[PDB]
Amino acid sequence: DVPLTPSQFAKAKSENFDKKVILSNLNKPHALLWGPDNQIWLTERATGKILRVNPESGSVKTVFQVPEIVNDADGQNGLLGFAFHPDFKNNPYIYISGTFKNPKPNQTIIRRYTYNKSTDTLEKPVDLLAGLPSSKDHQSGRLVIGPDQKIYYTIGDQGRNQLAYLFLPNQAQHTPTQQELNGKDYHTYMGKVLRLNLDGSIPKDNPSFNGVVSHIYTLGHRNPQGLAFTPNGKLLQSEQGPNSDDEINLIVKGGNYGWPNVAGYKDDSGYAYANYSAAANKSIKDLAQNGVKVAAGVPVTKESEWTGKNFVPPLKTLYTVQDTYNYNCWPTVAPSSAYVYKGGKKAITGWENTLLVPSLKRGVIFRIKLDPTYSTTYDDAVPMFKSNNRYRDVIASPDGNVLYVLTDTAGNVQKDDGSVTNTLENPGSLIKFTYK
Amino acid sequence: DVPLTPSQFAKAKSENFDKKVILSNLNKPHALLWGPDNQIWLTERATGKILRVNPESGSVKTVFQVPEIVNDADGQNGLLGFAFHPDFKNNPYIYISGTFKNPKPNQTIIRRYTYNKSTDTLEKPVDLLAGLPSSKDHQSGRLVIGPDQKIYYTIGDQGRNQLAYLFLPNQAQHTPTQQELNGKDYHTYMGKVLRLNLDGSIPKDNPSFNGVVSHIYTLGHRNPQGLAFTPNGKLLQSEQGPNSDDEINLIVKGGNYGWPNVAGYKDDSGYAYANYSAAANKSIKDLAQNGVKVAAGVPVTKESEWTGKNFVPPLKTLYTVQDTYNYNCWPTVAPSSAYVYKGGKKAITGWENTLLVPSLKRGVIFRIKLDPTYSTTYDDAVPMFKSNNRYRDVIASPDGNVLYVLTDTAGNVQKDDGSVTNTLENPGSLIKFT
Ligand SMILES: [Ca+2]
Ligand SMILES: [Ca+2]
Ligand SMILES: [Ca+2]
Ligand SMILES: [Ca+2]
Ligand SMILES: [Ca+2]
Ligand SMILES: [Ca+2]
Ligand SMILES: [Pt+2]
Ligand SMILES: [Pt+2]
């Protein structure tokens, strides 16, 4: 899709909803879920706290604090994955992922907790999958349980080939050899959607990649922070692209989502793959022109030159630009989540078969319509709730007339006029929007 | 997708198959089908003939010649749609579409015939839907019967807003009012995929457009000459774009495929909608730079400026280029059909879940892989069988190791070196690749 202008973003104020800020100054609130108990449950990435919030009173209780979560003030690590077992009434399990120290500096661990209704706390931790890659960037860590009773987990490309990890070789395209799998060496588990058995084991029906079946379900992802099943069992996803080409994807078993060889469509438009890990020396600078213009000494591959297998293009890019685009703000929105709106007895008019995708950099929540079979998007990503806030997550109440959203505590956002501000209107908040 | 180069096309000689010409004296052979009798049945667009060829021996018989088919030597009109009833043994019907004079100068008629096995001919013609638009351009006319036992018919945009019909307002986005529909006025049936009951009536569960349920199933199409169901009931489609953006589409009930406001993706890239029907000066020229560069006096709308409803982007474009592209060849392939490769006991290795798309301009058959659920394409459109031929249609034998292709009688095609030739290697032929 083509980028909206500052003016188009500015006017998306959603005067059809009442806004009520339930909480503010949470410490990097990250994921929120409608709890089995009909309360809002939300995580603090930095602290590892699992908070339960009564939306009417805003009364908060720290249900549990995941011990030894490791978080860097300047990083995106910490407590990430958060889900309840689908049949919680009979399987009182909470699944999380987080950054922890790796004795063998960190690792990511997917762990199950048992919720004790009696003592209102979490206990009996079980590590389902450990030794996963960890870094300060592009951790992703969206964890959901599919209709197939499997854990689907997004694990970002760790920031390789940008900024602090510029010269490290991106592994989004790499997959484990059997020997690595045997040694539980999960270094290739970067830029992937993993599909695991509930016990953490490899599903025998996982796709095969380069002759090996591993936890990998799809590969070629950059920073997939959004993952949501549709009512008909499809898996939708949102992912942050580089200077361009944030994506809405349909996750298909064994698909290759192209990163880093391809950003968005395979169109050679506005992006090229500049591999700094293969650059002539580490003193070379990243011009930050999305590979369209690069400093001498870094090998560049057009998207069309990639010898790819099972490349799956995005359903929608936010956004795609041409090579002439001036990167020197970028034509992206930094989607932070992806939520399948299920409607309900007070379903919002026209919102059938929509995907809600919060934007960090634009301070909007996009509404993306799909056909009733969730096979295609219809039209464009429609901005809502414009404000000087970094929207981090969104859910709806079971009745469907109320949206609960999280905002970041700190960071930059585009103001109505297009300029950047780091003055966020509702820092680290839990906000409810009620359809009028 | 990004255009392949002439050398990339030139090398696509599919050397792993043996080519054999089965028939070489066809006149504008258009559609071919693997028939219920395990014979190949094929149409001749201008003559209206329906031929049946023994796939093994190559013997052929003219089963029928559809009377009064109208065709212009400079046009794409004539005998178009061709399909068998899916349960032919018990329902010996053949459905066609064709250009006929309109006594109310032409119309398109979707017509059923009954096959008589004993005299081996067609009889008892029944007009299922008449008064459909007709013109010399962008007729499309692929007719298939879906798993739902409904006829699906592609009817092109009639060439409006280009060449001889430059100044006629494209109706791809337009839909009938209930009055028009009640009066059997199908002028808006241009640039659509229609879905009709077997008797020609409107399916009660057809989608609604602008508040009306008509035979329209999808709208916003230019020249959709490819239509094929997948084994799991999805409807794949190919469509010719203008100077760019030929498409592979997944046809979804009630979808709007954007033409003419949007070519390919809604990307404002390499195309813009220059509406000549809205140019107050009818002497205005079409610079033919795909709307990117236009003469003064024609309103141009960017793809992103269109107020579209239910816009469905293509699965794949052949091809998409940037605004800097120089249209003075074009980044298209002119897909002439779309065939779902079903494999079989001698299936071609690696061709699972592929869609075969013959190219007129490039003289190749593209193979487009999809995932096993036919939800997404995998990788790119891979060219095969490069030749100086305009490939018109393609099917495979039941076992999967033989491909049967029709080639145009005449026209232009790109040679291995990128230059154009109107010297076709196999004019109006039925060829097989084993
Ligand atoms: Ca980005
Ligand atoms: Ca991608
Ligand atoms: Ca791209
Ligand atoms: Ca064309
Ligand atoms: Ca289209
Ligand atoms: Ca376009
Ligand atoms: Pt809205
Ligand atoms: Pt080949």
JSON list of N, CA and C in Angstrom, two decimals, chain B residues 21-42:
[
{"chain": "B", "resi": 21, "resn": "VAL", "atom": "N", "xyz": [3.93, -31.73, -32.72]},
{"chain": "B", "resi": 21, "resn": "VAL", "atom": "CA", "xyz": [2.74, -31.04, -33.21]},
{"chain": "B", "resi": 21, "resn": "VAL", "atom": "C", "xyz": [1.67, -32.10, -33.47]},
{"chain": "B", "resi": 22, "resn": "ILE", "atom": "N", "xyz": [0.50, -31.93, -32.89]},
{"chain": "B", "resi": 22, "resn": "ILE", "atom": "CA", "xyz": [-0.59, -32.88, -33.12]},
{"chain": "B", "resi": 22, "resn": "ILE", "atom": "C", "xyz": [-1.39, -32.44, -34.34]},
{"chain": "B", "resi": 23, "resn": "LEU", "atom": "N", "xyz": [-1.89, -31.22, -34.30]},
{"chain": "B", "resi": 23, "resn": "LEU", "atom": "CA", "xyz": [-2.61, -30.62, -35.42]},
{"chain": "B", "resi": 23, "resn": "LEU", "atom": "C", "xyz": [-1.96, -29.28, -35.76]},
{"chain": "B", "resi": 24, "resn": "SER", "atom": "N", "xyz": [-1.90, -28.96, -37.04]},
{"chain": "B", "resi": 24, "resn": "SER", "atom": "CA", "xyz": [-1.28, -27.70, -37.45]},
{"chain": "B", "resi": 24, "resn": "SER", "atom": "C", "xyz": [-2.16, -26.87, -38.37]},
{"chain": "B", "resi": 25, "resn": "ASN", "atom": "N", "xyz": [-3.40, -27.29, -38.61]},
{"chain": "B", "resi": 25, "resn": "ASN", "atom": "CA", "xyz": [-4.20, -26.53, -39.58]},
{"chain": "B", "resi": 25, "resn": "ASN", "atom": "C", "xyz": [-5.39, -25.87, -38.91]},
{"chain": "B", "resi": 26, "resn": "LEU", "atom": "N", "xyz": [-5.23, -25.52, -37.63]},
{"chain": "B", "resi": 26, "resn": "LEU", "atom": "CA", "xyz": [-6.36, -24.91, -36.94]},
{"chain": "B", "resi": 26, "resn": "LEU", "atom": "C", "xyz": [-6.48, -23.43, -37.24]},
{"chain": "B", "resi": 27, "resn": "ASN", "atom": "N", "xyz": [-7.71, -22.94, -37.17]},
{"chain": "B", "resi": 27, "resn": "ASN", "atom": "CA", "xyz": [-7.96, -21.53, -37.38]},
{"chain": "B", "resi": 27, "resn": "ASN", "atom": "C", "xyz": [-8.38, -20.88, -36.06]},
{"chain": "B", "resi": 28, "resn": "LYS", "atom": "N", "xyz": [-7.50, -20.03, -35.55]},
{"chain": "B", "resi": 28, "resn": "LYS", "atom": "CA", "xyz": [-7.72, -19.35, -34.29]},
{"chain": "B", "resi": 28, "resn": "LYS", "atom": "C", "xyz": [-8.26, -20.28, -33.22]},
{"chain": "B", "resi": 29, "resn": "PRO", "atom": "N", "xyz": [-7.53, -21.34, -32.94]},
{"chain": "B", "resi": 29, "resn": "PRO", "atom": "CA", "xyz": [-7.91, -22.29, -31.90]},
{"chain": "B", "resi": 29, "resn": "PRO", "atom": "C", "xyz": [-7.89, -21.53, -30.59]},
{"chain": "B", "resi": 30, "resn": "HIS", "atom": "N", "xyz": [-8.91, -21.71, -29.76]},
{"chain": "B", "resi": 30, "resn": "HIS", "atom": "CA", "xyz": [-9.00, -20.82, -28.60]},
{"chain": "B", "resi": 30, "resn": "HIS", "atom": "C", "xyz": [-8.99, -21.56, -27.28]},
{"chain": "B", "resi": 31, "resn": "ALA", "atom": "N", "xyz": [-9.95, -22.46, -27.12]},
{"chain": "B", "resi": 31, "resn": "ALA", "atom": "CA", "xyz": [-10.01, -23.19, -25.85]},
{"chain": "B", "resi": 31, "resn": "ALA", "atom": "C", "xyz": [-9.84, -24.67, -26.09]},
{"chain": "B", "resi": 32, "resn": "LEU", "atom": "N", "xyz": [-9.17, -25.34, -25.14]},
{"chain": "B", "resi": 32, "resn": "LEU", "atom": "CA", "xyz": [-9.13, -26.79, -25.24]},
{"chain": "B", "resi": 32, "resn": "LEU", "atom": "C", "xyz": [-9.43, -27.39, -23.87]},
{"chain": "B", "resi": 33, "resn": "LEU", "atom": "N", "xyz": [-10.07, -28.55, -23.94]},
{"chain": "B", "resi": 33, "resn": "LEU", "atom": "CA", "xyz": [-10.45, -29.24, -22.72]},
{"chain": "B", "resi": 33, "resn": "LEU", "atom": "C", "xyz": [-10.16, -30.73, -22.84]},
{"chain": "B", "resi": 34, "resn": "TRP", "atom": "N", "xyz": [-9.86, -31.32, -21.68]},
{"chain": "B", "resi": 34, "resn": "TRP", "atom": "CA", "xyz": [-9.77, -32.78, -21.65]},
{"chain": "B", "resi": 34, "resn": "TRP", "atom": "C", "xyz": [-11.22, -33.25, -21.45]},
{"chain": "B", "resi": 35, "resn": "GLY", "atom": "N", "xyz": [-11.81, -33.86, -22.47]},
{"chain": "B", "resi": 35, "resn": "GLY", "atom": "CA", "xyz": [-13.22, -34.18, -22.42]},
{"chain": "B", "resi": 35, "resn": "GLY", "atom": "C", "xyz": [-13.57, -35.40, -21.58]},
{"chain": "B", "resi": 36, "resn": "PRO", "atom": "N", "xyz": [-14.86, -35.58, -21.35]},
{"chain": "B", "resi": 36, "resn": "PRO", "atom": "CA", "xyz": [-15.37, -36.70, -20.56]},
{"chain": "B", "resi": 36, "resn": "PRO", "atom": "C", "xyz": [-15.15, -38.03, -21.24]},
{"chain": "B", "resi": 37, "resn": "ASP", "atom": "N", "xyz": [-14.85, -38.01, -22.54]},
{"chain": "B", "resi": 37, "resn": "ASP", "atom": "CA", "xyz": [-14.61, -39.21, -23.32]},
{"chain": "B", "resi": 37, "resn": "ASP", "atom": "C", "xyz": [-13.12, -39.48, -23.46]},
{"chain": "B", "resi": 38, "resn": "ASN", "atom": "N", "xyz": [-12.33, -38.72, -22.70]},
{"chain": "B", "resi": 38, "resn": "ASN", "atom": "CA", "xyz": [-10.88, -38.83, -22.77]},
{"chain": "B", "resi": 38, "resn": "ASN", "atom": "C", "xyz": [-10.33, -38.42, -24.12]},
{"chain": "B", "resi": 39, "resn": "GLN", "atom": "N", "xyz": [-11.10, -37.59, -24.81]},
{"chain": "B", "resi": 39, "resn": "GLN", "atom": "CA", "xyz": [-10.59, -36.97, -26.03]},
{"chain": "B", "resi": 39, "resn": "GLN", "atom": "C", "xyz": [-10.32, -35.50, -25.69]},
{"chain": "B", "resi": 40, "resn": "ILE", "atom": "N", "xyz": [-9.52, -34.89, -26.54]},
{"chain": "B", "resi": 40, "resn": "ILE", "atom": "CA", "xyz": [-9.30, -33.45, -26.37]},
{"chain": "B", "resi": 40, "resn": "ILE", "atom": "C", "xyz": [-10.33, -32.72, -27.22]},
{"chain": "B", "resi": 41, "resn": "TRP", "atom": "N", "xyz": [-11.01, -31.75, -26.63]},
{"chain": "B", "resi": 41, "resn": "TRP", "atom": "CA", "xyz": [-11.99, -30.98, -27.40]},
{"chain": "B", "resi": 41, "resn": "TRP", "atom": "C", "xyz": [-11.47, -29.54, -27.46]},
{"chain": "B", "resi": 42, "resn": "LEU", "atom": "N", "xyz": [-11.56, -28.96, -28.65]},
{"chain": "B", "resi": 42, "resn": "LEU", "atom": "CA", "xyz": [-10.99, -27.61, -28.78]},
{"chain": "B", "resi": 42, "resn": "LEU", "atom": "C", "xyz": [-11.88, -26.78, -29.69]}
]
